[PDB]
Write a protein that holds these residues in place. Sequence first.
Motif, mmCIF file in Angstrom:
data_model
loop_
_atom_site.group_PDB
_atom_site.id
_atom_site.type_symbol
_atom_site.label_atom_id
_atom_site.label_comp_id
_atom_site.label_asym_id
_atom_site.label_seq_id
_atom_site.Cartn_x
_atom_site.Cartn_y
_atom_site.Cartn_z
ATOM 1 N N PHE A 32 0.818 -1.205 0.000
ATOM 2 C CA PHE A 32 0.000 0.000 0.000
ATOM 3 C C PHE A 32 0.853 1.257 0.000
ATOM 4 N N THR A 33 1.916 1.291 0.804
ATOM 5 C CA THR A 33 2.783 2.463 0.745
ATOM 6 C C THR A 33 3.513 2.545 -0.584
ATOM 7 N N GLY A 34 3.771 1.404 -1.227
ATOM 8 C CA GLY A 34 4.332 1.448 -2.563
ATOM 9 C C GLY A 34 3.397 2.113 -3.548
ATOM 10 N N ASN A 69 -3.651 17.623 -0.184
ATOM 11 C CA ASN A 69 -2.467 16.856 -0.542
ATOM 12 C C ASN A 69 -1.480 16.743 0.605
ATOM 13 N N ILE A 70 -1.487 17.696 1.533
ATOM 14 C CA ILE A 70 -0.593 17.600 2.677
ATOM 15 C C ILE A 70 -0.918 16.356 3.489
ATOM 16 N N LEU A 71 -2.170 15.907 3.441
ATOM 17 C CA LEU A 71 -2.555 14.675 4.121
ATOM 18 C C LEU A 71 -1.889 13.464 3.482
ATOM 19 N N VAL A 92 1.768 13.563 4.424
ATOM 20 C CA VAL A 92 2.076 13.150 5.783
ATOM 21 C C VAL A 92 2.001 11.643 5.898
ATOM 22 N N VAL A 93 0.961 11.036 5.326
ATOM 23 C CA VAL A 93 0.819 9.590 5.464
ATOM 24 C C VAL A 93 1.989 8.869 4.814
ATOM 25 N N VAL A 94 2.368 9.277 3.601
ATOM 26 C CA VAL A 94 3.445 8.561 2.925
ATOM 27 C C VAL A 94 4.769 8.786 3.637
ATOM 28 N N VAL A 95 5.008 9.993 4.148
ATOM 29 C CA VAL A 95 6.256 10.243 4.860
ATOM 30 C C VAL A 95 6.327 9.398 6.119
ATOM 31 N N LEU A 110 4.213 5.833 14.796
ATOM 32 C CA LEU A 110 4.132 6.305 13.423
ATOM 33 C C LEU A 110 3.297 5.393 12.548
ATOM 34 N N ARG A 111 2.828 4.275 13.073
ATOM 35 C CA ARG A 111 1.848 3.476 12.368
ATOM 36 C C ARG A 111 0.421 3.860 12.718
ATOM 37 N N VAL A 112 0.223 4.726 13.709
ATOM 38 C CA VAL A 112 -1.088 5.323 13.893
ATOM 39 C C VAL A 112 -1.409 6.265 12.747
ATOM 40 N N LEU A 113 -0.401 6.860 12.115
ATOM 41 C CA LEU A 113 -0.654 7.711 10.962
ATOM 42 C C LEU A 113 -1.362 6.967 9.849
ATOM 43 N N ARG A 114 -1.214 5.648 9.793
ATOM 44 C CA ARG A 114 -1.912 4.883 8.778
ATOM 45 C C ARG A 114 -3.407 5.099 8.851
ATOM 46 N N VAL A 115 -3.938 5.436 10.025
ATOM 47 C CA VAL A 115 -5.382 5.533 10.121
ATOM 48 C C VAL A 115 -5.893 6.661 9.250
ATOM 49 N N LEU A 116 -5.016 7.548 8.789
ATOM 50 C CA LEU A 116 -5.495 8.622 7.938
ATOM 51 C C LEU A 116 -5.794 8.163 6.526
#
Lengths: 72, 136, 70, 535, 162, 72
Positions: free
Chosen positions: D437-439, D456-458, D461-464, D490-496
């Motif tokens: 998914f990150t790929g 797009n900043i969202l 942030v998620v990909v970073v 930093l895997r909580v960011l995945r929830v976005l």
Amino acid sequence: TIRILLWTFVQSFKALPYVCLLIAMLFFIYAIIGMQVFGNIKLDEESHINRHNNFRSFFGSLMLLFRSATGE
Amino acid sequence: LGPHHLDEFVRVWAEYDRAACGRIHYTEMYEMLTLMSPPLGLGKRCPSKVAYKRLVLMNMPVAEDMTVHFTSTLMALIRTALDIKIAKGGADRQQLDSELQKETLAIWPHLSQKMLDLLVPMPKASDLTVGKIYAA
Amino acid sequence: NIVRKYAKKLIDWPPFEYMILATIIANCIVLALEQHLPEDDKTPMSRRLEKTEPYFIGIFCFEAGIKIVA
Amino acid sequence: QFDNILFAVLTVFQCITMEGWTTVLYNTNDALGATWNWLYFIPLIIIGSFFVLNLVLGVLSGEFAKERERVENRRAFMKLRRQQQIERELNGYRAWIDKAHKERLLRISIRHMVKSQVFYWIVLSLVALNTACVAIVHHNQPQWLTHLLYYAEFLFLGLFLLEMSLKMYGMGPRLYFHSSFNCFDFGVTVGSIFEVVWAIFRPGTSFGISVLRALRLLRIFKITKYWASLRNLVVSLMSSMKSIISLLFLLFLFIVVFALLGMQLFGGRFNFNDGTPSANFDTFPAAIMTVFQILTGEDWNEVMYNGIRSQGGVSSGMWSAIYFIVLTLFGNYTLLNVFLAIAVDNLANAQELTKDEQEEEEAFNQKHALRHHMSVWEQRTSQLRKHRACHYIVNLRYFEMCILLVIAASSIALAAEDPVLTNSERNKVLRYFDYVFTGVFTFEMVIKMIDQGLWNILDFVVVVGALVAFALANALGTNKGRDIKTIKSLRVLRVLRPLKTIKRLPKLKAVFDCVVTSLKNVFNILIVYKLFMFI
Amino acid sequence: PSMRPIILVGPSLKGYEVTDMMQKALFDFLKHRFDGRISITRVTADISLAEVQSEIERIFELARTLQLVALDADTINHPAQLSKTSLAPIIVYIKITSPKVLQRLIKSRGKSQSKHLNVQIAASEKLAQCPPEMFDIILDENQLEDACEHLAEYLEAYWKAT
Amino acid sequence: PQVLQHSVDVTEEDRGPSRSNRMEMSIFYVVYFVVFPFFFVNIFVALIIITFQEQGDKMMEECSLEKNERAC
Ligand SMILES: CC(C)CCC[C@@H](C)[C@H]1CC[C@H]2[C@@H]3CC=C4C[C@@H](OC(=O)CCC(=O)O)CC[C@]4(C)[C@H]3CC[C@]12C
Ligand SMILES: CC(C)CCC[C@@H](C)[C@H]1CC[C@H]2[C@@H]3CC=C4C[C@@H](OC(=O)CCC(=O)O)CC[C@]4(C)[C@H]3CC[C@]12C
Ligand SMILES: CC(C)CCC[C@@H](C)[C@H]1CC[C@H]2[C@@H]3CC=C4C[C@@H](OC(=O)CCC(=O)O)CC[C@]4(C)[C@H]3CC[C@]12C
Ligand SMILES: CC(C)CCC[C@@H](C)[C@H]1CC[C@H]2[C@@H]3CC=C4C[C@@H](OC(=O)CCC(=O)O)CC[C@]4(C)[C@H]3CC[C@]12C
Ligand SMILES: CC(C)CCC[C@@H](C)[C@H]1CC[C@H]2[C@@H]3CC=C4C[C@@H](OC(=O)CCC(=O)O)CC[C@]4(C)[C@H]3CC[C@]12C
Ligand SMILES: CC(C)CCC[C@@H](C)[C@H]1CC[C@H]2[C@@H]3CC=C4C[C@@H](OC(=O)CCC(=O)O)CC[C@]4(C)[C@H]3CC[C@]12C
Ligand SMILES: CC1(C)O[C@@H]2[C@@H](CO[C@@]3(COS(N)(=O)=O)OC(C)(C)O[C@@H]23)O1
Ligand SMILES: CCCCCCCCCCCCCCCC
Ligand SMILES: CCCCCCCCCCCCCCCC
Ligand SMILES: [Ca+2]
């Protein structure tokens, strides 16, 4: 007179399929955050993270969040 | 008026006329309006010259047996109650009706000129109405 | 029992409606002061107050009387 | 329990009022098995408790729209709008009073300075220090603070005495009570003197009515464009005050009647062998404050259980489940018809009052000195009153719709993580899915930034976050202080990831923007709310 | 006259501090903003009786110096009251388009003039029935800045015209 | 209700409770309710109701001559 209300107010629920998709998305986001963060609290029947009320699973956290939304 | 009163028209039509696109002549008109509740017009307690001066504001063409259509009468009641683009007579009411036809096409393009002409029945001055019969 | 010359309808008037308004306030205060004890027990103050109910009943039946005859 | 029909229409009424409906759900989960019960108690809460609030709000709001337009109400509103016109022009005229041994020698410069735009700001930047001094008190505040703030109350109180008298002895007591907050500041000053004395002669309880000066911060709104919307609200509230008080008074009379009735039924019968509960009916101040619970409807459950075992039990005693039903229904609903009538009336007034300022100062004088975004309510009430080169081939009809499927699959894969079993089978499979998914997300973020340069900043942030977590988990994972939590966090960011859909779907974006514009509408009142809650 | 004389009127009888302060505020604006082109003069005589006619020549000669001269007349509060003289002043009507604000303004000024409310109201109301064309300029708008701008516009047009 | 129970049972700084002492601290908890749960929350419901814009209206000034009751 009951039927006219029910029809009238259910039609206007059929014309807002995305207003109640934002609420489903809110519940989803918070259920996932809950599972990540409070998912591994040890269940204690003395507390309010019970065998009933816990973030241990997606549907358990969904029930926890619905319980809280309804102010319980 | 909203549609809340407006379905009573179907009931009184089916019972008192059973017209099926016509079959009224004019008797059903004052057989209709002179009894039912007055958000649509006359009502029971107003079978008088007040009814006369309401009818003289409704004008619409004729058919085989001096009859009229269903929805033509529907718009007749609707506009005579809500005052939707109606004049006092003459080519003035027909040019207002042209305005109304333009507005109807502007809202709904899906109305074929058969049904559209039915909704804008175009009562020209030469063509006598079912309204200007008992009036004169 | 339709006896005219009431003379009581003129008593329904400015001052005797502002005294009833005060007897009602006094009564509500008295009902506020009461305390309910579990099993037939009564505080001294509630026994003290239970000796005013006849006064209020008297004034209220007087109001019924004057309004009814007027 | 669901034994009779009368025991079931009482349990279900309890669940619809949302009091202790989860205890019932949990009981039946234990007693039958937790698989199907959620189908009874969720739609019982959704249909019976939420949908019925929607119906009640809708019906009342229709009734309030239809009742504001009765002749006897349009009349009493025009009487308010005319008097607002009088005052609005009168103040402008009172601006024309610009007239240019000590009865006139110093008392000419006082009233000059003490109304200058630097004086208002000195007073309003010193009251904002006062309400920061009395907001840092806590328990066990360091002993220097107690004394510093002790001097501070006197200093600020005396200073406000001075800059109040300078308005009274320096501009005139007779014409002093002619500004609302000027009366208010005099009242707060006398109250603070009261508080000082009463603290001197009864140390202890110090309820400290000097934070009330923070209300003056609302005057800051005068410098914005939101002043009219709020001054009109306060005008419409202050006009209709003999009818708000005479209406809170009727709420109080019916609370008193129900308190006395509860004293009759349950007075002194609450002395259980456990101990009399705090939600008594014995004395009056404790009957008032349990009828208040039952109205605000929160834990009316337990009071009803006490009032049932008081008169018997599940036995001769259940006839008294009818005082707590006729007081948690006709209370949860007559108190939203009262407090919604008050707030819809006095706020549609302040919306029509402020629509007849811009319809005069911006449409009358601006012409004679030489719809349009009308809401649903306004429309309806007016109608009633009338009676680089390569990547640009990103667009394929299957890229902005095939990424949506990946967003949906990633969101669903979030749901299936086991929170507890960190290294189970599922979590490893989903970690490989995380790589996938990150790929996908980076291979599309890069091409978008190519075609767009630098919502797009969202995405960013998620990909970073995903890239950083993957890098510093693959690299070492150890030798940095307690950094298992770093990847876990930093895997909580995945929830976005679900949030990414909002910009994709043009109608979900529109509903989101409706929510945001509603939030901006209630934001001059959210701040008044926050200020009062702070006080 | 070379230039039309300046008289302002409309709130109430001059000599009552309401009208006094209104006229003085606008005249003081005329001074300070235009200090170097206009001169304000004070009249304590009855020009409707034109010692009485000795001042009209003075009025003419200030008007004959190519600089504006505003009159602080103290007797004329009507358009019909000066329908005979040859002065032909520029008449500015300081109007109030609603009475209630007027009586609130009158009681607003202390207390003493509350002993003059009833009678001042008569003059103001009768002014409301005076013909509009009898006034060169209407002054009713609530604010000082805008009314001052209105007067600046009309009088700058006048000054450009001559 | 539990916060009210703690608030009445209140004696002095760093001293334990005493049941139904200071029963007047319940005034703070009714003036609170009259203000925030009753008054401002209904102010918010009323602001969102009064100022609610129609969702999609960009069709020639919202059917300039035939609107909701006329059009429908
Ligand atoms: C056995 C008892 C305890 C309860 C039984 C169930 C009730 C909740 C149901 C049964 C019959 C229902 C009623 C059947 C018919 C009507 C008339 C109807 O009224 C109208 O629509 C008015 C007429 C019109 O304008 O057309 C709607 C409400 C009501 C009372 C219904 C409300 C709900 C009722 C009372
Ligand atoms: C327990 C409750 C909450 C659920 C009951 C179901 C209702 C949500 C639905 C089920 C069937 C519906 C009915 C199905 C069909 C019609 C005909 C239809 O009639 C019309 O369009 C208006 C009348 C006309 O013009 O003929 C809409 C109303 C009505 C009675 C509906 C009213 C709403 C009803 C009762
Ligand atoms: C107004 C509605 C139509 C908007 C869209 C729905 C949402 C309000 C959400 C938030 C609360 C959610 C519910 C919260 C709790 C549950 C229980 C949950 O239960 C289980 O899967 C297993 C049993 C258990 O809960 O222990 C299933 C999803 C469901 C019904 C959720 C379905 C979707 C709901 C109703
Ligand atoms: C501009 C106005 C409206 C707001 C200013 C903010 C303050 C009112 C807030 C900001 C953070 C708060 C502080 C956050 C944390 C603490 C520590 C805590 O005290 C202790 O640690 C207890 C033991 C000790 O006093 O050493 C509670 C008080 C205090 C200073 C709080 C007091 C109130 C403060 C200063
Ligand atoms: C409900 C589904 C159809 C919604 C759409 C999403 C699906 C297309 C995919 C995306 C990721 C998938 C998951 C990815 C990994 C796994 C682990 C996989 O392995 C196990 O958990 C096996 C354990 C056992 O043997 O009991 C089982 C399916 C599951 C949950 C998949 C279920 C189907 C999912 C949710
Ligand atoms: C900011 C706006 C909403 C103004 C409204 C707020 C105040 C007018 C309210 C807020 C809470 C109320 C206080 C909360 C509780 C009490 C305690 C009560 O008991 C005492 O402190 C006095 C006797 C004692 O304890 O010795 C007296 C009323 C008082 C001060 C209340 C008086 C009115 C207050 C100050
Ligand atoms: C329909 C609606 C909005 O509620 C009614 C009715 C008339 O006005 C009410 C509103 O309460 S208040 N005191 O703000 O005027 O005031 C009273 C007289 C209490 O009744 C109110 O208007
Ligand atoms: C002339 C006064 C101007 C006030 C400007 C800010 C007003 C903000 C709204 C006030 C609402 C008060 C409600 C208090 C609780 C019942
Ligand atoms: C709605 C306003 C009334 C609120 C009633 C609760 C507060 C009562 C304050 C006085 C308490 C006196 C206690 C005496 C001993 C029980
Ligand atoms: Ca609860």
